[PDB]
Each structure stands twice: as structure tokens, then as C-alpha cells.
């Protein structure tokens, strides 16, 4: 029986969606089916920030960030706990977690 009305993807109004490679396993997954994360993280950790800022030759240099796009397949996204199973009623919910 059908688990999802959208079949776990966003392929409405077309026939084919180009595939992408999973960042974890390199599996081929449709771009609209893959789970997409955009991580904008400081290039230095919150531990190394103190030493790096103390040793900087500038004043208020503001460290650059790191913008990484991750395209997990369903298996890898479930294993990495990026998404998890939900109840049959709660599956329909589409608002992102508040974080």
C-alpha cells in the first residue's frame, strides 16, 4: 500500500529528475528525493576560535565560514539521524524542526 502521497519525492509535473551522488555513500538518488542539508559552519571550531583569534595579526578579522551542501540518500540520512521515522499521522507534517 502507498506510504506517502508524494512517494517520498517532489516529482510533480515532470517525468524525469536528474540524479545526484550521495555525499556519504555516493549512491545515485534523484535530486528531488535526496535529503538536502546546507551547513554553514565556522571554519574553526568553537574551541580553536580563542587561540586563532588571539594569534590573528588583524583586529576583528571575523573568521570565514564554510558552506557545505550535503545530499543524503534515504538509507544514509536515516542512519545519520538527519531524519527519523515518524508516526503515520506525524509523517504528513512538513514544517522543519524548530532547532
Amino acid at each position: 500500500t502507498k506510504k506517502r502521497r508524494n512517494n517520498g519525492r517532489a516529482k510533480k509535473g515532470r517525468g524525469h529528475v536528474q540524479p545526484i551522488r550521495c555525499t556519504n555513500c555516493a549512491r545515485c538518488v534523484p535530486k528531488d528525493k535526496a535529503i538536502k542539508k546546507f551547513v554553514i559552519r565556522n571554519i574553526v571550531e568553537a574551541a580553536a576560535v580563542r587561540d586563532i583569534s588571539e594569534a590573528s595579526v588583524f583586529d576583528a578579522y571575523v573568521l570565514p565560514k564554510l558552506y557545505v551542501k550535503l545530499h543524503y540518500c534515504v538509507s544514509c540520512v536515516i542512519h545519520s539521524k538527519v531524519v527519523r521515522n515518524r508516526s503515520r499521522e506525524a509523517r504528513k507534517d512538513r514544517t522543519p524542526p524548530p532547532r
Partner: protein, 88 residues
């Protein structure tokens, strides 16, 4: 381009943006218009200039996206090309 007296005299070779800036500038509910021109200055220096721009959300806009239509993108790219050629 030359070295004299323990002194290296550099010349302009190119320009670029840091990866952080370009990565930050690409957001997900707007279009990125990109143009490029191969243009020679009045002293034989033939450069290739790349221009990038992004459509701007209005301050009273309620629509999530700010997409320009394809003809609008083409007009913007032609304007980019002509302005860069004029300025170079």
C-alpha cells in the same frame, strides 16, 4: 614581471572573490545572473571579466521568491556585458 635590486615588481594578473563571499551570496529563493566578456584594453591587455548578480527581494514583498523571467535575465546579462565592455 621583473626583479631588480632584491626587489620584485609585480603587475596585475587577475582578480577574484574569496570562496566564502561567493558561497554566502548564493541563496535559494532568487536567480543568479552571470555574464562574461573577453575584452582588450587600449594597451593590448586582453582580459576576461565575469560579472555576477542576484535578484533583490523588495522590502514589502510577500512572495517567497524573487525570480526574474528568462527575458529579464537576458536583458540583465546584456546590460552587464555592455557595461563591462564600456568600462574596460
Amino acid at each position: 614581471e621583473d626583479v631588480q635590486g632584491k626587489n620584485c615588481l609585480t603587475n596585475f594578473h587577475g582578480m577574484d572573490l574569496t570562496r566564502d563571499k561567493m558561497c554566502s551570496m548564493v541563496k535559494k529563493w532568487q536567480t543568479m545572473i552571470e555574464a562574461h566578456v573577453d575584452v582588450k584594453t587600449t594597451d593590448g591587455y586582453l582580459l576576461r571579466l565575469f560579472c555576477v548578480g542576484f535578484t533583490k527581494k523588495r522590502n514589502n514583498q510577500i512572495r517567497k521568491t524573487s525570480y526574474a523571467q528568462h527575458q529579464q535575465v537576458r536583458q540583465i546579462r546584456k546590460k552587464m556585458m555592455e557595461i563591462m565592455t564600456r568600462e574596460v
